[PDB]
């Protein structure tokens, strides 16, 4: 027996259903999304951090002439200066003081502490949703993990479940993401090679230990002026530090739909949105024919005080006549009414107290016990409490929250105009026909 | 001095231009796409190969009953059977002829040869193009590698180039790709976990040696039926072999635009399509004032026999009168004409014979020598050969790819009708005027 439902993607909130086989007793089913993991596919564009600007020791030709040779270091910069005549401790490191060419060399690398403090740039793609699910049918329960795509099945030893696709796809991540010490930022970054001094990614590499480090930090050498040997230079501030100062709040604190952004691997956990269509192939052994479970004769519903709060703020009683002691499942067949309990011991003759939650000001919902139904009609007051730390267990339906008094008044006011226009038309027709007869 | 051009993305075919700063002599710029690789953003989803069906040794509880457990191994399959009464070599392996419960266990792993003979399933997205470009300006030639996106720059010691964005976006790879031994296939494969037995991807894993292998080979065990011990079983045929047999042609032999597909990393080299905009800031040292380069007093053009084709089949002669001996650049500003030479020696007065190629039936193209123009008009016949092993160096237009004789005939036959209609309107107006005046 294959049963298909549309379970709301709301972790921690059970969904109750009643499989109603044609020739067998109905069986209870409860569906609990224990966990969900929306994980995208990531590729490491590069890793950036506070660059260490390393300046190799300057070299001086005595009074000959040096030349700048091209290298492959990150933002390699080299310059030639004329007569310098450097001083160290005696004060003359070079003879022939004129034409005293000096070479100034500088480049950048990764700082020693970058092994931990570093930002990884990623491009995220279409994200697949995986849900951990607990299903309990009748007396037997099972745990499983499935992929929400509509093709990937889940198998638990008798149970075959097909989940998905999601009704409305959503990915909190933009096209491009940055990861720093577990903090996620949806901040666009320059592409590989497209580097900008003073901005994020002002030093890029494929790995911390990778030797193909590429840098463009806008470093320029300056002519030395003091007698003592030293190479001056100027350089733009670390754009990584600038981004860190102006990083903004991480995605953990601004991801919509209230869900935890985790790393290693990048993913979003317990993240409620839309619905999942799930089809379960219940094993035939679970069912039992209606001749075994007692079938009640007649049942009546008396609704107690009801409040359409976010919790089980309603109660009712079911008075039943039956043939034998049993364990009937109890269900609510309305979309704006849920029940705390799914099954109950049932005697031959008696009554049972039940609890329920709703969201409309009116209750007009169908309860059912060992298959057979009964309407319950009631008026519910607004909830006394303003705020609860518990999510709403149902959703108010389109124009189903209109109370009986409001319905009566609105229908009366519209029907007044409707009656007025029809009597106007019949009066007009009567006058026209009267004139035609007496014309 | 920034000069912007639209270089056609065609490897091996030079693009020639003339930069004309107002107060300085013109300079010749040859721009040659030596190499160009388009690499997409890639991420490994899983690998697959022909499963090795590993079937552990059976166990018999010799006078009792066992229970099958559960494990996380790839496609863990286990079954329990009743009395078996197995034989080894002697004639007996259990007493208790009844109640000889047996356990059959089986699963799948990667075959030892899968370390090389395996397929990798990838998901690709928008691809950035990288161009290796040789630029010759004046008397200086330089080589560069850059990303054609309009922001990523390139620099060669005085040259400063910004290329992109590509005019037309194109990637020869569909959203899902497969790689096997360097052969690239544009195949749609099952998603991670969306595993169908008997087809490609029947086994998946994130790495060859990973222990978290997921597998679904549709393995079903049978009750042993012979006296001797064994574990009968049937299994779906390896879908990897089925895809190998029905792999079709690889993407190397189907990629359009003649794009050579290479692996490690996956990319397409020498992929000619569209045009790339390039802005080059030429160093000020190359330019020279007009007073130094010999300005030519005048020029006359005489075009010899020509055929519009890909090769340099057309020829012309320039009679030049000048004042000093120099090295003028020669250019064609027409879109449908290119020159073999870009810099030619010039004397006080003389003749120079040049070669050129075009694509129009008639050459109506303007040549320029040290900035001074000449509208070369000619009449090119269709070529002799049908097929050349050399690409066309000029695009085919519509406003110019029509013979002047056909232009004249078409215009005459279309203007005859216009003349007829205007004389018709004139005679109608004359008749109206005559009947109005004479009424």
Curated annotation (Swiss-Prot), chains A, B:
Protein name: Spike glycoprotein E1
Membrane disposition: Single-pass type I membrane protein
Parent-protein start and end of this portion: 798 to 1236 of 1236
Quaternary state and interactors: Interacts with spike glycoprotein E2. The precursor of protein E3/E2 and E1 form a heterodimer shortly after synthesis. Processing of the precursor of protein E3/E2 into E2 and E3 results in a heterodimer of the spike glycoproteins E2 and E1. Spike at virion surface are constituted of three E2-E1 heterodimers. After target cell attachment and endocytosis, E1 change conformation to form homotrimers. Interacts with 6K protein.
Highest rank taxon of the organism: Viruses
Spans annotated as E1 fusion peptide loop: 84-101
Function comment: Class II viral fusion protein. Fusion activity is inactive as long as E1 is bound to E2 in mature virion. After virus attachment to target cell receptor PCDH10 and endocytosis, acidification of the endosome induce dissociation of E1/E2 heterodimer and concomitant trimerization of the E1 subunits. This E1 trimer is fusion active, and promotes release of viral nucleocapsid in cytoplasm after endosome and viral membrane fusion. Efficient fusion requires the presence of cholesterol and sphingolipid in the target membrane.
Annotated TM spans: 409-429
Organism: Western equine encephalitis virus (WEEV)
């Amino acid at each position: 027996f294959e049963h298909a439902t549309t379970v709301p993607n709301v972790p921690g909130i059970p969904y109750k259903a009643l499989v109603e086989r044609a020739g067998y007793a109905p069986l209870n089913l409860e569906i609990t999304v224990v966990s969900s993991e929306l994980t995208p596919s990531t590729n490491k564009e590069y890793v950036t951090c506070r660059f260490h600007t390393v300046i190799p020791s300057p070299q001086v030709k005595c009074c000959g002439s040096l030349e700048c040779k091209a290298s492959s270091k990150a933002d390699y910069t080299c310059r030639v200066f004329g007569g310098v005549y450097p001083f160290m401790w005696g004060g003359a490191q070079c003879f022939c003081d004129s034409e005293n060419t000096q070479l100034s060399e500088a480049y950048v690398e990764f700082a020693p502490d970058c092994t931990i403090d570093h930002a990884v740039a990623l491009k995220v793609h279409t994200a697949a949703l995986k849900v951990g699910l607990r299903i309990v049918y009748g007396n037997t329960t099972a745990h499983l993990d499935t992929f929400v795509n509509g093709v990937t099945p889940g198998s638990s030893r008798d149970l075959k479940v097909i989940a998905g696709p999601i009704s409305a796809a959503f990915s909190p991540f933009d096209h491009k993401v940055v990861i720093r010490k577990g903090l996620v930022y949806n901040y666009d970054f320059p592409e590989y090679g497209a580097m900008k001094p003073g901005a994020f990614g002002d030093i890029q590499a494929s790995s911390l230990d990778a030797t193909d480090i590429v840098a463009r930090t806008d470093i320029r050498l300056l002519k030395p002026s003091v007698k003592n040997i030293h190479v001056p230079y100027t350089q733009a501030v670390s754009g990584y530090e600038m981004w860190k100062n102006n990083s903004g709040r991480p995605l953990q604190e601004t991801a919509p739909f209230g869900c935890k952004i985790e790393v290693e691997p990048l993913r979003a956990s317990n993240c409620a949105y839309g619905h999942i269509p799930i089809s379960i192939d219940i094993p035939d052994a679970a069912f039992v024919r209606s001749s075994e479970s007692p079938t009640i004769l007649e049942v009546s519903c008396t609704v107690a005080d009801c409040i359409y709060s976010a919790d089980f703020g309603g109660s009712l009683t079911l008075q039943y006549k039956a043939d034998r002691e049993g364990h009937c499942p109890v269900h609510s067949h309305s979309t704006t009414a849920v029940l705390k309990e799914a099954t109950t011991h049932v005697t031959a003759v008696g009554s049972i107290t039940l609890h329920f939650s709703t969201s409309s000001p009116q209750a007009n919902f169908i309860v059912s016990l060992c298959g057979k139904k009964t309407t319950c009609n009631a008026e519910c007051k607004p909830p006394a409490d303003h705020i609860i730390g518990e999510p709403h267990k149902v959703d108010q339906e389109f124009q189903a929250a209109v109370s009986k008094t409001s319905w009566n008044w609105l229908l009366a006011l519209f029907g007044g105009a409707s009656s007025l226009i029809v009597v106007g038309l019949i009066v007009l027709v009567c006058s026209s026909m009267l004139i035609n007869t007496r014309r």
